[PDB]
Amino acid sequence: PLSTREANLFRTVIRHYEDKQYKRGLKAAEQILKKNPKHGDTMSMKALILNAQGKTEEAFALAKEALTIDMKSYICWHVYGILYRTNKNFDEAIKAYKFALKLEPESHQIQRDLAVLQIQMRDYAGYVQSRLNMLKARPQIRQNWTALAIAYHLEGNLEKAEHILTTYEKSLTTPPPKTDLEHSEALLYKNTIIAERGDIERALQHLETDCKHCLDRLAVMELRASYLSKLARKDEAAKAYRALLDRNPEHMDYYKGLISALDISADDEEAQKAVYDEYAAKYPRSDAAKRLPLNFLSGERFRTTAKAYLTLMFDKGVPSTFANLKHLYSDSFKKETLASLAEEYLNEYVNDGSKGKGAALYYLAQHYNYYMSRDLTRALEYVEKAIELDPKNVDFHMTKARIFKHQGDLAKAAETMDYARSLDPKDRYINSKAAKYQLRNNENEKALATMGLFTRAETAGGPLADLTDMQCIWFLTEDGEAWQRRGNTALALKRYHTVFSIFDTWQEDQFDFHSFSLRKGQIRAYVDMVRWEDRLREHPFYFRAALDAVNLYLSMYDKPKDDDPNGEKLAATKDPLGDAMKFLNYILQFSPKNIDGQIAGFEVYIRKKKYLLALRCLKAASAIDKNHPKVLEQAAKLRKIVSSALDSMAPKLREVIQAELVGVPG
Amino acid sequence: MDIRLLRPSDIPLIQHANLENLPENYFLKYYLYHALSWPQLSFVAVDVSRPAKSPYDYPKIVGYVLAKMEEEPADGVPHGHITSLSVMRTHRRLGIAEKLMRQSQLAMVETYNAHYVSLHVRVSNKAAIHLYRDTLGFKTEKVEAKYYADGEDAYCMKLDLTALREQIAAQREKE
Amino acid sequence: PAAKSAEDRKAAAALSKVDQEAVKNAMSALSKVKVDPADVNLLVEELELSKAKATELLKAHDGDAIKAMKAYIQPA
């Protein structure tokens, strides 16, 4: 090939790259390409430097070109992969990385980078193999052991994952000091693994013997209480929850934990209150210790306690009191009693802000606004009286606006909410609400200007740009739905797609952490993130916008540098059903329990002429709610289509259709 | 309400709470970096009595404290920093900010041997300053002029945790 | 990459940017019925699966296309 003056020039191309001297290296590489113009290795490295200077597009084509010239060159495929890894096409990257390593194994940098893409795409088997190799090369570093343990663990091989962890520990000649954070985290990770195998006996044993003095105190204390209770060592578990109770009086489940350990039946109302009162006395500032007893108390016992609670909160002026008690309104007696008690307190009151009598009225205002005891007329009166007493209270007027909303008069609701904003212009919460109410009244251009009071000023592209940057999903979704209501298909679609793009980003966000978490050693958090990521788009934040998109494409189907700033290309699509699939696939795979998703999936697939997938959607929807009105209609609609077009489609499809179709009642 | 340790799955709704209540916003990726480096330091207030609209509803976040330690110590002396702290307006005056801070300060000392905790504040706030000074016992250390793109000066405020440390060390040794 | 403002947001990018014998032994310790092509082509089209997943699914059910399709559409 190039032989020797060129040989040293290639080397100074690598040196200048590792020294970030791009210009001296291009000119250097160009001296080789003038001598060897079809030298792939030199050409790819030139393709490489361009990408390192935002010429991604040419860069890729050059690398593609370089790889064609020498498909057996390991540099070209590596480069091809590196480009891909920068550009987030992890699938062609994993494939391309694969060929470079196939030409030159043993390369530690490449193997490191292969393992990351592999865990990123959850190729567990690949990741296990990868870490084992890596552990073999540098076994003096604890990280490589934990990493392989992580790999085994995520693969489902808990026994082997525990083995890898324990094997390392047996090599330690001296016990690390209790100040050593890495070791502390490694022990708990092993402990949680013991528990995941379901060996609660052993995990507790290991907890008390080896983990007793770990630095994550909350973790040790909660595991202890959790384990003791499951083992029915109730006295000791009672004691464990008390240590935890003292740390954080505001966490509902700790009281629950304690009460179970004492063997107190939910029917014994007075015996439960004794428990709560002891800590209410011990921790006067715990809200929980005062509030929770209202869940199981009844009759006069409820009234007496509820009054004493209401008096504390009203005197202190707490605005979240209703919101904090409204879950109880499912029970009629507790509902009526609370309203009666507020009224009782009002008359009984003896003598600034909304502290006191106004605050009680606000409970009543919210009471008659709440859908379980709704009386919008009386609510208006109470809120008017509160606002009478305290005209500058933001929360009062905000509730008033919400009442108008319920009367169905959206304009008045947005006007009042916007007024509410004007009383605390420094407070963004009420600002967001005002914007929201304005969007609910289809006043888009106004709402963006409302939000503009808080987005960074000299952002280019105005408020919308900053909110997009800052991943503001609520506004994007609401605005889209608003634009859709007005017939503006283009901007609606653009917004929903942006939410789709925000989630792609969130999924890609974990990329740097596969490596980063090994340095911190904070492994449990790491496995939490992967697992959360494994169910990422089950989040309603995805679901809402995605079902909107799909719904808007369904509508479009029956009624026929930024590359698309007004989302104009979207509305003009020729394949709406095709563009819907990326939204739908995530809906069906991560949110299967939502009949709404399945019904919409069904509609997408019958139109797509894909009658087999339609049935899968139908069978799903029917399994969730047999007598749902939509699934009966669509069920009946499929069988008509099946009996008509069955002669043109293959026999196995007719058979499977007809077989699994009778199940389903239409 | 309901206070518990930060969870990675909370991050989208934490971020959303931040977007609603505070002008300082960050990428989701920045919450991750906190969550994965110092998972023991950040706590949330949760609205638990919220009825669930769907089988996949996540916990509705009405308050949070996001804290970190500086990886590069001032004088080889470990100390925490509050990156962000806020409470929904609908949930104010229940003592929440104070509680979140006390959970966090305690974990900073226990797990990381924090000697103090610090924070920055834009100069026109009041409610917060009474929280940090009057309620939490922060003293003011210096003024940061033009802390960022926005011209408002910032206070750097600091809380000595020496007192918490002896109380903790006396009780850890005695048990 | 290391955007100026906040210093830390730059830093977030930055943070994101010998007793061998027991070990060696520990590490050494650490380590189909012919199928019809047309069936694979039928499933790819009607379930919209990759050829890999369609083949794999068939292989999971001994090349019985009608069995494989019936299994796949059953909900959790």
Short mmCIF file of N, CA and C in Angstrom, two decimals, chain A residues 181 185 215-218 247-248 250-252 285 291 316 318-320 323-324 327 355 394-395 424 426-430 432-433 454 456 469-472 474 506 509 512-513 516-517 520 522 524-526 528-529 532 535 538-541 590-594, chain B residues 1-5 7-9 11-13 15-16 19-29 32-33 35-40 43 47-49 51 54-58 71 88-94 98-99 102-103 106-107 110-112 124 172 175:
data_model
loop_
_atom_site.label_atom_id
_atom_site.label_comp_id
_atom_site.label_asym_id
_atom_site.label_seq_id
_atom_site.Cartn_x
_atom_site.Cartn_y
_atom_site.Cartn_z
N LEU A 181 -16.90 4.22 50.76
CA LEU A 181 -18.22 4.27 50.10
C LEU A 181 -18.45 3.24 49.00
N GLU A 185 -21.64 0.51 49.04
CA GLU A 185 -22.54 0.30 47.91
C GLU A 185 -22.49 -1.10 47.30
N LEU A 215 -23.08 3.05 55.26
CA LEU A 215 -23.26 4.48 55.31
C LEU A 215 -24.64 4.93 54.84
N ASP A 216 -25.26 4.17 53.93
CA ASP A 216 -26.61 4.53 53.51
C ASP A 216 -27.59 4.13 54.62
N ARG A 217 -27.78 5.01 55.60
CA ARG A 217 -28.52 4.61 56.79
C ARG A 217 -29.99 4.31 56.51
N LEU A 218 -30.64 5.12 55.68
CA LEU A 218 -32.04 4.88 55.34
C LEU A 218 -32.22 3.53 54.65
N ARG A 247 -37.07 9.20 61.96
CA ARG A 247 -36.33 9.88 60.90
C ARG A 247 -37.20 10.73 59.97
N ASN A 248 -38.43 10.30 59.71
CA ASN A 248 -39.30 10.95 58.74
C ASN A 248 -40.79 10.69 58.99
N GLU A 250 -43.34 11.88 58.00
CA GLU A 250 -44.24 12.29 56.92
C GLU A 250 -44.46 11.20 55.87
N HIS A 251 -43.99 9.98 56.12
CA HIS A 251 -44.04 8.96 55.07
C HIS A 251 -45.08 7.89 55.43
N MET A 252 -46.27 8.01 54.84
CA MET A 252 -47.43 7.14 55.10
C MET A 252 -47.16 5.68 55.45
N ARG A 285 -44.90 18.63 64.71
CA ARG A 285 -44.85 19.13 63.34
C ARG A 285 -45.17 18.11 62.24
N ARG A 291 -53.16 13.70 60.33
CA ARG A 291 -54.10 13.58 59.23
C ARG A 291 -54.59 12.16 58.92
N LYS A 316 -53.91 28.08 61.21
CA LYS A 316 -52.60 28.26 60.60
C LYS A 316 -52.73 28.77 59.17
N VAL A 318 -53.59 27.06 56.38
CA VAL A 318 -53.12 26.12 55.34
C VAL A 318 -54.16 25.95 54.23
N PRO A 319 -53.77 26.30 52.98
CA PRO A 319 -54.61 26.18 51.79
C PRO A 319 -54.76 24.82 51.18
N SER A 320 -53.90 23.90 51.57
CA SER A 320 -54.01 22.58 51.00
C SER A 320 -54.83 21.67 51.86
N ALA A 323 -57.60 19.75 49.81
CA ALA A 323 -56.96 18.90 48.84
C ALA A 323 -56.36 17.72 49.57
N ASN A 324 -55.99 17.96 50.81
CA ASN A 324 -55.35 16.97 51.63
C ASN A 324 -56.35 15.96 52.25
N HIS A 327 -59.94 12.92 49.39
CA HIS A 327 -59.95 11.48 49.12
C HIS A 327 -60.96 10.76 49.96
N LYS A 355 -55.81 34.06 56.91
CA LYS A 355 -55.69 33.23 58.09
C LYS A 355 -57.09 33.22 58.74
N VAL A 394 -54.20 34.93 45.89
CA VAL A 394 -54.08 34.21 44.62
C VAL A 394 -54.87 32.91 44.57
N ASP A 395 -54.78 32.10 45.62
CA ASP A 395 -55.42 30.80 45.65
C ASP A 395 -56.95 30.88 45.61
N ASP A 424 -49.67 37.89 41.86
CA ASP A 424 -48.32 37.45 42.19
C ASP A 424 -47.56 37.23 40.90
N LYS A 426 -44.62 37.34 40.37
CA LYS A 426 -43.32 36.72 40.56
C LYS A 426 -43.41 35.24 40.67
N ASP A 427 -44.63 34.73 40.68
CA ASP A 427 -44.84 33.32 40.93
C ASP A 427 -45.23 32.56 39.67
N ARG A 428 -44.40 31.61 39.29
CA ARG A 428 -44.62 30.96 38.02
C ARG A 428 -45.79 29.99 38.02
N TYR A 429 -46.11 29.36 39.16
CA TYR A 429 -47.19 28.38 39.16
C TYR A 429 -48.49 28.94 38.64
N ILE A 430 -48.88 30.09 39.15
CA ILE A 430 -50.11 30.73 38.73
C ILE A 430 -49.95 31.24 37.30
N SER A 432 -48.33 29.62 34.94
CA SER A 432 -48.55 28.45 34.09
C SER A 432 -50.00 28.08 33.95
N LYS A 433 -50.71 28.21 35.05
CA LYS A 433 -52.13 27.96 35.11
C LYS A 433 -52.88 28.92 34.19
N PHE A 454 -41.67 34.30 31.82
CA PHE A 454 -40.69 33.49 32.55
C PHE A 454 -39.64 32.71 31.78
N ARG A 456 -36.30 32.38 29.32
CA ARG A 456 -35.10 33.22 29.22
C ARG A 456 -35.22 34.19 28.04
N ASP A 469 -36.49 23.51 24.34
CA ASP A 469 -35.20 23.24 24.97
C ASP A 469 -35.26 22.66 26.37
N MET A 470 -36.08 23.26 27.20
CA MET A 470 -36.21 22.87 28.60
C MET A 470 -37.19 21.73 28.79
N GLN A 471 -37.54 21.09 27.68
CA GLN A 471 -38.29 19.84 27.70
C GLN A 471 -39.64 19.96 28.39
N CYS A 472 -40.31 21.08 28.12
CA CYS A 472 -41.59 21.37 28.74
C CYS A 472 -42.74 20.67 28.02
N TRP A 474 -45.73 19.60 29.23
CA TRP A 474 -47.09 20.00 29.47
C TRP A 474 -47.56 21.04 28.49
N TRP A 506 -34.72 11.44 26.23
CA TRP A 506 -34.71 10.83 27.55
C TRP A 506 -34.19 9.40 27.51
N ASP A 509 -30.50 9.55 26.97
CA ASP A 509 -29.84 10.21 28.11
C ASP A 509 -29.07 9.27 28.99
N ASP A 512 -24.38 7.99 28.55
CA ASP A 512 -23.14 8.27 29.23
C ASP A 512 -23.11 7.63 30.63
N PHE A 513 -24.25 7.16 31.14
CA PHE A 513 -24.28 6.69 32.53
C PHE A 513 -23.92 5.23 32.75
N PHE A 516 -20.57 5.98 33.56
CA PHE A 516 -20.46 6.93 34.66
C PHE A 516 -20.78 6.32 36.02
N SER A 517 -21.82 5.49 36.07
CA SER A 517 -22.24 4.82 37.30
C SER A 517 -21.18 3.86 37.85
N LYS A 520 -18.78 6.16 39.93
CA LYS A 520 -19.39 6.53 41.19
C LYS A 520 -19.58 5.29 42.04
N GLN A 522 -22.21 3.82 42.37
CA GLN A 522 -23.59 3.86 42.85
C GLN A 522 -24.55 3.02 41.99
N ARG A 524 -27.01 0.43 42.55
CA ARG A 524 -28.45 0.26 42.72
C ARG A 524 -29.23 1.33 41.98
N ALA A 525 -28.72 2.57 42.02
CA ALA A 525 -29.37 3.67 41.34
C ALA A 525 -29.32 3.41 39.86
N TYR A 526 -28.17 2.94 39.41
CA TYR A 526 -27.99 2.59 38.02
C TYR A 526 -29.01 1.53 37.56
N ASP A 528 -31.83 0.91 38.86
CA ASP A 528 -33.12 1.59 38.88
C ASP A 528 -33.36 2.38 37.62
N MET A 529 -32.34 3.09 37.15
CA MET A 529 -32.54 3.91 35.96
C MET A 529 -32.79 3.01 34.72
N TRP A 532 -36.24 1.69 34.95
CA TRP A 532 -37.18 2.76 34.66
C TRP A 532 -37.16 3.01 33.16
N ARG A 535 -39.17 0.79 31.02
CA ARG A 535 -40.60 1.03 30.94
C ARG A 535 -40.86 2.51 30.70
N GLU A 538 -44.22 4.27 29.28
CA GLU A 538 -45.48 3.90 29.87
C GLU A 538 -46.01 5.15 30.58
N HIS A 539 -45.15 6.15 30.68
CA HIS A 539 -45.48 7.37 31.39
C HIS A 539 -46.63 8.07 30.67
N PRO A 540 -47.64 8.56 31.42
CA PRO A 540 -48.77 9.24 30.79
C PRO A 540 -48.38 10.44 29.95
N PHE A 541 -47.23 11.02 30.28
CA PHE A 541 -46.64 12.13 29.52
C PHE A 541 -46.37 11.79 28.07
N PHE A 590 -45.90 -0.61 25.68
CA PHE A 590 -45.62 -0.11 27.04
C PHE A 590 -46.83 0.24 27.87
N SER A 591 -47.95 0.43 27.18
CA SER A 591 -49.21 0.76 27.81
C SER A 591 -50.38 -0.17 27.43
N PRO A 592 -50.15 -1.50 27.41
CA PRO A 592 -51.19 -2.44 26.95
C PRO A 592 -52.50 -2.38 27.73
N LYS A 593 -52.48 -2.00 29.00
CA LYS A 593 -53.70 -1.98 29.83
C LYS A 593 -54.68 -0.83 29.57
N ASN A 594 -54.41 -0.03 28.55
CA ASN A 594 -55.26 1.11 28.28
C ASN A 594 -56.16 0.79 27.08
N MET B 1 -47.48 16.39 53.81
CA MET B 1 -47.83 15.41 52.81
C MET B 1 -47.09 14.08 53.00
N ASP B 2 -46.35 13.66 51.97
CA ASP B 2 -45.66 12.37 52.01
C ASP B 2 -44.22 12.63 51.52
N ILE B 3 -43.25 12.45 52.42
CA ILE B 3 -41.81 12.57 52.09
C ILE B 3 -41.00 11.31 51.99
N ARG B 4 -40.28 11.18 50.88
CA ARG B 4 -39.49 10.00 50.62
C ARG B 4 -38.30 10.31 49.71
N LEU B 5 -37.34 9.40 49.67
CA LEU B 5 -36.14 9.57 48.87
C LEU B 5 -36.45 9.66 47.37
N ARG B 7 -36.51 9.06 43.50
CA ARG B 7 -36.48 7.89 42.65
C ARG B 7 -36.27 8.32 41.20
N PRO B 8 -35.43 7.61 40.43
CA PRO B 8 -35.24 7.95 39.01
C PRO B 8 -36.55 8.09 38.22
N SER B 9 -37.56 7.26 38.47
CA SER B 9 -38.82 7.38 37.71
C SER B 9 -39.57 8.67 38.05
N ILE B 11 -38.22 11.44 37.91
CA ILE B 11 -37.54 12.57 37.31
C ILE B 11 -38.37 13.33 36.28
N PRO B 12 -39.15 12.64 35.43
CA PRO B 12 -39.95 13.49 34.53
C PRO B 12 -40.91 14.44 35.25
N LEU B 13 -41.59 14.00 36.30
CA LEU B 13 -42.54 14.83 37.06
C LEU B 13 -41.87 15.79 38.03
N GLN B 15 -39.03 17.29 37.15
CA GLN B 15 -38.69 18.29 36.16
C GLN B 15 -39.89 19.14 35.83
N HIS B 16 -41.05 18.52 35.76
CA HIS B 16 -42.27 19.24 35.45
C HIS B 16 -42.64 20.21 36.60
N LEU B 19 -40.33 23.18 36.23
CA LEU B 19 -40.82 24.02 35.13
C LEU B 19 -41.99 24.90 35.54
N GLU B 20 -42.84 24.39 36.41
CA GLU B 20 -44.02 25.12 36.82
C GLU B 20 -43.70 26.24 37.83
N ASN B 21 -42.74 26.00 38.73
CA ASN B 21 -42.52 26.88 39.89
C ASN B 21 -41.27 27.71 39.89
N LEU B 22 -40.35 27.38 39.00
CA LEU B 22 -39.07 28.03 39.06
C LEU B 22 -38.59 28.46 37.68
N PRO B 23 -37.92 29.64 37.63
CA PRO B 23 -37.37 30.11 36.35
C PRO B 23 -36.09 29.41 35.94
N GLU B 24 -35.40 28.78 36.89
CA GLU B 24 -34.20 28.01 36.57
C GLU B 24 -34.57 26.58 36.22
N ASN B 25 -34.38 26.22 34.95
CA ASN B 25 -34.75 24.89 34.48
C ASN B 25 -33.55 24.15 33.93
N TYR B 26 -33.66 22.83 33.87
CA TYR B 26 -32.56 22.02 33.38
C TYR B 26 -33.04 20.89 32.50
N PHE B 27 -32.12 20.33 31.72
CA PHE B 27 -32.41 19.13 30.97
C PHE B 27 -32.63 17.96 31.92
N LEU B 28 -33.45 16.99 31.50
CA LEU B 28 -33.67 15.78 32.29
C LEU B 28 -32.36 15.11 32.64
N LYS B 29 -31.44 15.10 31.67
CA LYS B 29 -30.14 14.50 31.85
C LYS B 29 -29.42 15.01 33.11
N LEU B 32 -30.78 13.22 36.20
CA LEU B 32 -30.11 11.91 36.24
C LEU B 32 -28.76 11.97 36.93
N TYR B 33 -27.95 12.95 36.54
CA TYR B 33 -26.59 13.09 37.04
C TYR B 33 -26.57 13.24 38.56
N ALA B 35 -29.20 12.10 40.49
CA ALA B 35 -29.79 10.84 40.92
C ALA B 35 -28.81 9.68 40.93
N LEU B 36 -27.89 9.67 39.97
CA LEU B 36 -26.94 8.58 39.92
C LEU B 36 -25.62 8.81 40.68
N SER B 37 -25.30 10.06 41.00
CA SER B 37 -24.08 10.36 41.76
C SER B 37 -24.34 10.37 43.25
N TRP B 38 -25.43 11.01 43.64
CA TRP B 38 -25.77 11.12 45.04
C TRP B 38 -27.24 10.81 45.27
N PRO B 39 -27.62 9.53 45.10
CA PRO B 39 -29.02 9.10 45.23
C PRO B 39 -29.53 9.23 46.66
N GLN B 40 -28.63 9.41 47.62
CA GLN B 40 -29.02 9.50 49.03
C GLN B 40 -29.36 10.90 49.49
N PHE B 43 -34.71 14.43 48.02
CA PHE B 43 -35.96 13.93 48.56
C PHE B 43 -37.11 14.63 47.88
N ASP B 47 -47.88 14.08 46.59
CA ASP B 47 -49.32 14.17 46.82
C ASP B 47 -49.99 12.81 46.66
N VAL B 48 -50.10 12.11 47.79
CA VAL B 48 -50.50 10.70 47.87
C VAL B 48 -51.99 10.51 47.84
N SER B 49 -52.73 11.55 48.17
CA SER B 49 -54.17 11.43 48.25
C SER B 49 -54.81 11.75 46.92
N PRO B 51 -56.23 10.85 43.50
CA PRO B 51 -56.90 9.70 42.87
C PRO B 51 -56.20 9.30 41.56
N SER B 54 -55.40 6.56 35.77
CA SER B 54 -54.95 5.53 34.83
C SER B 54 -54.13 4.45 35.54
N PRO B 55 -54.07 3.23 34.96
CA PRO B 55 -53.25 2.19 35.58
C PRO B 55 -51.75 2.48 35.62
N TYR B 56 -51.27 3.47 34.86
CA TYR B 56 -49.85 3.78 34.86
C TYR B 56 -49.47 5.15 35.42
N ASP B 57 -50.35 5.79 36.20
CA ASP B 57 -50.01 7.09 36.77
C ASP B 57 -48.80 7.01 37.67
N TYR B 58 -47.90 7.96 37.49
CA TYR B 58 -46.72 8.06 38.33
C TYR B 58 -47.04 8.98 39.52
N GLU B 71 -17.61 17.82 43.99
CA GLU B 71 -16.64 16.75 43.80
C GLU B 71 -15.23 17.31 44.08
N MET B 88 -44.74 23.51 45.37
CA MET B 88 -45.98 23.99 44.72
C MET B 88 -46.75 25.02 45.55
N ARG B 89 -47.30 26.06 44.92
CA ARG B 89 -48.00 27.08 45.70
C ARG B 89 -49.17 26.51 46.51
N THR B 90 -49.87 25.54 45.93
CA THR B 90 -51.02 24.89 46.57
C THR B 90 -50.66 24.12 47.83
N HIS B 91 -49.37 23.93 48.07
CA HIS B 91 -48.89 23.10 49.17
C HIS B 91 -47.94 23.80 50.11
N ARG B 92 -48.00 25.13 50.10
CA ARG B 92 -47.12 25.95 50.92
C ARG B 92 -47.72 26.05 52.32
N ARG B 93 -46.86 26.37 53.28
CA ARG B 93 -47.18 26.51 54.69
C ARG B 93 -47.61 25.21 55.38
N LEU B 94 -47.04 24.09 54.93
CA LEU B 94 -47.12 22.81 55.64
C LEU B 94 -45.77 22.37 56.20
N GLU B 98 -38.70 22.96 54.88
CA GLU B 98 -37.92 22.67 56.07
C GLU B 98 -37.66 21.15 56.17
N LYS B 99 -38.70 20.34 56.01
CA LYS B 99 -38.54 18.88 56.10
C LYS B 99 -37.57 18.28 55.06
N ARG B 102 -34.12 19.04 56.03
CA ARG B 102 -33.62 18.26 57.16
C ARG B 102 -33.34 16.82 56.77
N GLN B 103 -34.10 16.26 55.84
CA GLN B 103 -33.79 14.92 55.36
C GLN B 103 -32.47 14.89 54.61
N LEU B 106 -29.15 15.60 56.78
CA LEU B 106 -28.86 14.40 57.56
C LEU B 106 -28.16 13.32 56.72
N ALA B 107 -28.62 13.12 55.49
CA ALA B 107 -27.99 12.14 54.62
C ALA B 107 -26.60 12.59 54.14
N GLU B 110 -24.28 11.85 57.18
CA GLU B 110 -24.15 10.41 57.39
C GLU B 110 -23.33 9.76 56.27
N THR B 111 -23.75 9.90 55.02
CA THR B 111 -23.09 9.18 53.92
C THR B 111 -21.79 9.83 53.42
N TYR B 112 -21.73 11.15 53.45
CA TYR B 112 -20.61 11.85 52.83
C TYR B 112 -19.76 12.71 53.77
N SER B 124 -33.57 39.28 45.22
CA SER B 124 -34.91 39.75 45.58
C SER B 124 -35.86 38.78 46.33
N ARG B 172 -24.34 7.81 67.40
CA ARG B 172 -23.90 6.63 66.66
C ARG B 172 -22.94 5.76 67.46
N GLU B 175 -24.99 3.82 70.47
CA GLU B 175 -25.76 2.66 70.06
C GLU B 175 -24.88 1.45 69.77
#
